[PDB]
Amino acid sequence: TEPSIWTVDDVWAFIHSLPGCQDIADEFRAQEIDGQALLLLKEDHLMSAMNIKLGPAEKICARINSLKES
Amino acid sequence: TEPSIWTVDDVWAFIHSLPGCQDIADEFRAQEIDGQALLLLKEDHLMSAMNIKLGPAEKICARINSLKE
Amino acid sequence: TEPSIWTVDDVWAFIHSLPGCQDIADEFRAQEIDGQALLLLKEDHLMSAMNIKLGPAEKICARINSLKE
Amino acid sequence: RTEPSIWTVDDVWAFIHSLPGCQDIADEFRAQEIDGQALLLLKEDHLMSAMNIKLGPAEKICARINSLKE
Amino acid sequence: EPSIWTVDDVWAFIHSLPGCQDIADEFRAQEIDGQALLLLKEDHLMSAMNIKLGPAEKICARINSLK
């Protein structure tokens, strides 16, 4: 599990696997978010740049922070 | 009845029961905050993302922190 | 009066009585900071939501800690 | 030795052009007359709003730039 | 005397320290007086003045000596 080398398709699959994100995943792909970009995102970006609501933004960022661990 | 598995509606009722929060509850719901998101909130998010003032934000976060114990 | 049960109006008066804070008290009232919120404040909160500089923020927080003991 | 603050529009062009997927985005940096000084002031939102760059690339480009500032 | 220092007493004290001649203007920009200076902590310097931990540590150490 090295998210640092994930592709845009890998990130889409990852986001799509998260509860309630089947649709939000297309926004990650539309913004060409790959593994490198994924690890740099913060709630701010998710809300400002991708119109994601605060609840999902935080739960997604919590799932991202868990990846940053092995 | 464990906040970590609360729904958006559960969080709405919880915030709604709080002094001065009957409208602010609608903002939690519009933001789809469930138990898992509620427990990750910090004062800064309430003020920035939901435009809540610092006094209510402090008191809400305090009510949230008492849940975690 | 114990600070924990102070109203927004009480907090205004307290901050307003402090050297250099006559205007800063208006920001406290605008933020609907009552006693409960006042005692939960930290310097970062003062610097963030109220643009207060660290020098006064440290002094306002010390004056606040003076209340809590 | 390097000093990004005194880079010209051409220097910045070459730098962005060396970045993965940016051979084309570099022409927009030049069209916007971004020199070293401007380069160091850029943020993701500027890149998205002013240059039509998507968030994933904007994030990665700003990260490479932040590496310069060090 | 340090407890009764002015915002100027501080600028003057900080300016005296290695590498601290310029960041001394920050203390006046944040209006740090004696009582503020003596209640200041490392995390505060990192947050409010963008200072890195090494310098924040050394600056606070010089301040704690005053006491």
Q: What is the DSSP string of C15-36?
A: HHTSTT-TTHHHHHHHTT--HH
Q: Which of B48, B51, B58, B65 to mutate to test the interface with C (most CBs of C within 10 A)?
A: B58
C34 touches chain B (CB under 8 A): yes
Tracing tokens 């008290």 back to the chain, one arrives at C25
Shortest CA distance to D19 belongs to which of D43, A2, D51, D67?
A: D67
Nearest to B33 among A43, A47, A54 (CB): A54
Q: How far apart are CA B13 and CA B21, in angstroms?
A: 10
Q: Which long-range contacts (CB under 8 A, 24 or more apart) does C1-5 make?
A: C2/C35, C3/C35, C3/C38, C3/C39, C3/C67, C3/C68, C4/C35, C4/C36, C4/C39, C5/C35
Given a contact cutoff of 8 angstroms between Cβ atoms, the answer to whether D36 and D22 are in contact is no
**Tokens matching residue D57:** 């690339």
Given a contact cutoff of 8 angstroms between Cβ atoms, the answer to whether D61 and D68 are in contact is no
Give per-residue burial for E16-25: e unless 16+ CB within 10 Å, then b.
eeeebeebbe
Which CATH architecture is the domain E1-67 placed in?
Orthogonal Bundle (1.10)
D54 touches chain A (CB under 8 A): yes
- DSSP class of residue C11? H
A near C: at least 3 beta-carbon pairs less than 8 Å apart? no
Yes or no: is domain D1-70 CATH 1.10.150.50?
yes
Resolution (A): 2.3
**Tokens matching residue C19:** 């050297």
Q: What is the DSSP string of A19-56?
A: TT-TTHHHHHHHTT--HHHHTT--HHHHHHHH---HHH
What are the residue boundaries of the structural domains of chain D, listed by start?
Answer: 1-70
Experiment type? X-ray
Task: Give me the CATH code for the B1-69 domain, please.
Answer: 1.10.150.50
